[PDB]
Amino acid sequence: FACKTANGTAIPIGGGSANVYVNLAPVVNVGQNLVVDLSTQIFCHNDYPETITDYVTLQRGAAYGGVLSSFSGTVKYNGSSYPFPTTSETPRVVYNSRTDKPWPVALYLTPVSSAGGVAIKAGSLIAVLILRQTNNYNSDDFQFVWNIYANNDVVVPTG
Amino acid sequence: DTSEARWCSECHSNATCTEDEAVTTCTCQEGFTGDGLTCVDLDECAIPGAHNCSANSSCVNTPGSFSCVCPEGFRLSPGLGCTDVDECAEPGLSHCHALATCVNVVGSYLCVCPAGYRGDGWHCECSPGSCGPGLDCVPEGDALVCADPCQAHRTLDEYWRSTEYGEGYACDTDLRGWYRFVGQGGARMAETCVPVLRCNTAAPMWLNGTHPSSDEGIVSRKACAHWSGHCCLWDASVQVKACAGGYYVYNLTAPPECHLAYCTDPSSVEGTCEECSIDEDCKSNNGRWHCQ
Ligand SMILES: *[C@@H]1O[C@H](CO)[C@@H](O[C@@H]2O[C@H](CO)[C@@H](O[C@@H]3O[C@H](CO[C@H]4O[C@H](CO)[C@@H](O)[C@H](O)[C@@H]4O[C@@H]4O[C@H](CO)[C@@H](O)[C@H](O)[C@H]4NC(C)=O)[C@@H](O)[C@H](O[C@H]4O[C@H](CO)[C@@H](O)[C@H](O)[C@@H]4O[C@@H]4O[C@H](CO)[C@@H](O[C@@H]5O[C@H](CO)[C@H](O)[C@H](O)[C@H]5O)[C@H](O)[C@H]4NC(C)=O)[C@@H]3O)[C@H](O)[C@H]2NC(C)=O)[C@H](O)[C@H]1NC(C)=O
Ligand SMILES: *[C@@H]1O[C@H](CO)[C@@H](O[C@@H]2O[C@H](CO)[C@@H](O[C@@H]3O[C@H](CO[C@H]4O[C@H](CO[C@H]5O[C@H](CO)[C@@H](O)[C@H](O)[C@@H]5O)[C@@H](O)[C@H](O[C@H]5O[C@H](CO)[C@@H](O)[C@H](O)[C@@H]5O)[C@@H]4O)[C@@H](O)[C@H](O[C@H]4O[C@H](CO)[C@@H](O)[C@H](O)[C@@H]4O)[C@@H]3O)[C@H](O)[C@H]2NC(C)=O)[C@H](O)[C@H]1NC(C)=O
Ligand SMILES: *[C@@H]1O[C@H](CO[C@@H]2O[C@@H](C)[C@@H](O)[C@@H](O)[C@@H]2O)[C@@H](O[C@@H]2O[C@H](CO)[C@@H](O)[C@H](O)[C@H]2NC(C)=O)[C@H](O)[C@H]1NC(C)=O
Ligand SMILES: *[C@@H]1O[C@H](CO)[C@@H](O[C@@H]2O[C@H](CO)[C@@H](O)[C@H](O)[C@H]2NC(C)=O)[C@H](O)[C@H]1NC(C)=O
């Protein structure tokens, strides 16, 4: 098992962390979901799918930066919605192919009432995701830390 | 000045005692604060006259002196403060695991075992197939190390595994690790489909693909089993390494059932199969050592 970002950043066998740069809407109104489709940005694969069957969960999802203070929302994991920041571990995802497959995670973030201006600044950390991997073979428990940064500014108009 | 002592018995254990022509003086050393006659355990860092430690380092008291212990990777040289030094060169500053490589960093030393191993710097539990060539990860005592399978393999002399041995009942759930076949147990893994109810097992297993050239590395190969009127309905993967001396070592792994067992080919170290009867004509043919 090894993972890489759409931008090429990779984490070797053993676990680690990687930086995931995502694009965001330059303006979002109060009451409208900001959508961060992270399934297009994080890809993983099975290095030996002939025998071992690996299970992958989101152990913890937490808001950071402008999202933690000016937004609230949910995380869509494997098609099901869960609170964000997360309060429970998400179900296991089976990876059974050497072909890289998306990590099914999408953030739906709704701004809170704001005086106005730029809520999320470019270069700021907007989320941290801890990928947890288990299997049915042994006690593999590797942590893959995804540091989610905004490429652009997000204006929240007064409302 | 005020701590002239009549006898050495007046000096406390926190003070050093000097006999100068039987005149005794009690002078406590840096790291103890007092008048000399009696001193208490208190860091010299706050004496009158103060201390002279580097700002980055933290002033601490040691048994016999107060000391300036830098963050690791640096050591104090009197007069220069924290001086750059590779603590990994000194066995009194770095206590890494023998296989782990000490690397020097700002504020610590870090023991890092070489790339490929899985560990926290002290116990790098490697996985089989991650080691460099000529070596593979095997247990030694209570830890995992990369070693040459040609010297760490087990050996088997189970004559029941021969392809003509149809009588019996077996289960290879106990086979794990590196193995070798010797004697009547055959020279190498069987490379062809073996009929059902052979090799003293219900369903026989055989190697699909040929053994590699001598001193070829660890290559994954496929393996098949025969049951019912179909052969290699299920396909597995095994690894074979060639060794000096003309023998092969094999990654034997338990099967999915309890009626599967690996067959072995006859060693055939003879050009003529004189262990067969003279009335059972030996067929000396290339790749087909047999008698009929
Ligand atoms: C081990 O046990 C075997 C019993 O199953 C025994 O027979 C072997 O059986 C294999 C399973 O079908 C077979 O693999 C496939 O065979 C197809 C046809 O066989 C080709 O090769 C023969 C010589 O080996 C020739 O006589 C044939 O004429 C034929 O020749 C051409 O070969 C080309 C390249 O090999 C192909 O491009 C052509 O299609 C083929 N025909 C013509 C007219 O040109 C192959 O088509 C097949 O190709 C695979 O790869 C292609 C490219 O990626 C792909 O398009 C195919 O779909 C096919 O994909 C799948 O590949 C898997 C491995 O990557 C394979 O699984 C494993 O195959 C192993 C092969 O040794 C082994 O059997 C293992 O247990 C399998 O799990 C899939 O089977 C395969 N999918 C399909 C549908 O087949 C591929 O070569 C072996 O060739 C055949 N070997 C023979 C007959 O000698 C073995 O003898 C035995 N080995 C021992 C004892 O050492
Ligand atoms: C004897 O063989 C048997 C098999 O019949 C074996 O039993 C099990 O074998 C499987 C398969 O190896 C083990 O499962 C996986 O093993 C992985 C380690 O090796 C595999 O992956 C390698 C990936 O690259 C690594 O190694 C290279 C150097 O080779 C290095 O540069 C990389 O950075 C990285 O470290 C791959 O290279 C390797 O292939 C080499 O070795 C094989 C032989 O093993 C050889 O045939 C090849 O030609 C090549 O030389 C091999 O493919 C391990 O990483 C992996 O763990 C990850 O994946 C699983 C599954 O996705 C995840 O669950 C896990 O979290 C990790 O992400 C997995 O362990 C399995 O562990 C064996 N079972 C046991 C009990 O050992 C025996 O162990 C072998 N040895 C003995 C003594 O019997
Ligand atoms: C005695 O101290 C001087 C200067 O030390 C400064 O004052 C101390 C009270 C303490 O606060 C130190 O951290 C101060 O730096 C030593 O001369 C060097 O001075 C430079 C700049 O001031 C400093 O960067 C070096 O680390 C000092 N060298 C050391 C601390 O070894 C002088 O060497 C000290 N005498 C010794 C240690 O015998
Ligand atoms: C704080 O620690 C740093 C490094 O841990 C010290 O920097 C070193 O200083 C020595 C002496 O000048 C140099 O030889 C090294 O090359 C420096 N290393 C690095 C990484 O900068 C620094 O001196 C310490 N602070 C003080 C006040 O001594």
Residue numbers in the entry:
A (entry chain F): 1 to 159
B (entry chain U): 25 to 316
Give the authors' words.
By combining AlphaFold2 predictions with X-ray crystallography and cryo-EM, we show that these proteins contain a bipartite decoy module whose new fold presents the high-mannose glycan recognized by FimH. The structure rationalizes UMOD mutations associated with kidney diseases and visualizes a key epitope implicated in cast nephropathy.
To gain further insights into this process, which was previously visualized only at low resolution by cryo-electron tomography, we reconstituted in vitro the complex between UMOD and FimHL from uropathogenic E. coli (UPEC) UTI89 and studied it by single-particle cryo-EM. Despite high conformational variability, this yielded a map with a nominal resolution of 7.4 Å, whose comparison with that of free UMOD showed density for a single copy of FimHL bound to the D10C region that presents the N275 glycan.
